[PDB]
Structure 1
Amino acid sequence: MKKIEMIEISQNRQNLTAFLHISEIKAINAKLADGVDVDKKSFDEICSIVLEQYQAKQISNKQASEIFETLAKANKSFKIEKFRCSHGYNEIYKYSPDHEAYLFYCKGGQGQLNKLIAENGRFM
């Protein structure tokens, strides 16, 4: 599993507390380093310290792949992306929460989508 994929899994999911069931923390606290114990911690804090221990090279790559995939399957709640493009149809829809749907915004490919993402922010 790639490395920026773990960064995007850290970045995109909702910040939850008490989402880790007993088997996950039972594997995790013995699986990760001896530094931090993660009890009642937010998703961003756990993912940031695991990505930092992956950056400052102390733990291997396959362990980080397993624990980031475990943090992926343990979370089902996603943040809303505010901007969804139709690729072949060359369109860009924008999320409107009162409709709970993506209303039409502008004609544009991926570069216009990245421009709008840099302007308005990538998430809701």
Structure 2
Amino acid sequence: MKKIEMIEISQNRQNLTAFLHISEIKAINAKLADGVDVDKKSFDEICSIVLEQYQAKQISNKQASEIFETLAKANKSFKIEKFRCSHGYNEIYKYSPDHEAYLFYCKGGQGQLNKLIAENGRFM
């Protein structure tokens, strides 16, 4: 796993507490350092600790890949993105929470999508 996929898998999910079975808790504890510990924790802080350990030249890439694989199996809820681009047909749709669907917003591609993402924010 690349580190770009690590920050991607850290930011696109919700923050959940008690989302792990105890077997996966000791499985993750077998794959982390000696000093730090996670118990009764939420998602973000775990992402911050493993990102700080991977920023350090102390934790390997296969081990952080096992950590992020386990976080990938565990978390099942995603954040709904605010904008969605239909790519061949050159259209941009915006999420409306009252219709529970995406309604038509404008015409454009990837540059216009990045522009409204930088102007309004990526997630809901």
In structure 2, list runs of 5 or more residues that go unmatched: none
**TM-score scaled to structure 1, two decimals?**
0.97
User: Whole-Å Cα distance in 2 between the matches of residues 54 and 121 of structure 1?
Assistant: 27
User: Whole-Å Cα distance in 1 between the matches of residues 89 and 22 of structure 2?
Assistant: 46
User: Whole-Å Cα distance in 1 between the matches of residues 109 and 65 of structure 2?
Assistant: 32
How far 1:35 moved relative to its partner? Answer: 2.8
How far 1:77 moved relative to its partner? Answer: 0.1
How far 1:78 moved relative to its partner? Answer: 0.2
In the other structure, the counterpart of 2:55 is 55
Superimposed CA distance per residue, residues 47-70 of structure 1 (whole angstroms, 9 cap, x where no aligned partner): 111011000111100011111011
Superimposed CA distance per residue, residues 73-114 of structure 1 (whole angstroms, 9 cap, x where no aligned partner): 101100011101001111110000010001111101001000
The secondary structure found in structure 2 opposite 1:16 is coil
Superimposed CA distance per residue, residues 18-43 of structure 1 (whole angstroms, 9 cap, x where no aligned partner): 00111211111121112321111110
The share of aligned pairs that are identical, in percent, is 100
The secondary structure found in structure 2 opposite 1:106 is strand
The secondary structure found in structure 2 opposite 1:94 is strand
After TM superposition, the runs of 4+ consecutive aligned structure 1 residues lying more than 2 A away are: none
In structure 1, list runs of 5 or more residues that go unmatched: none
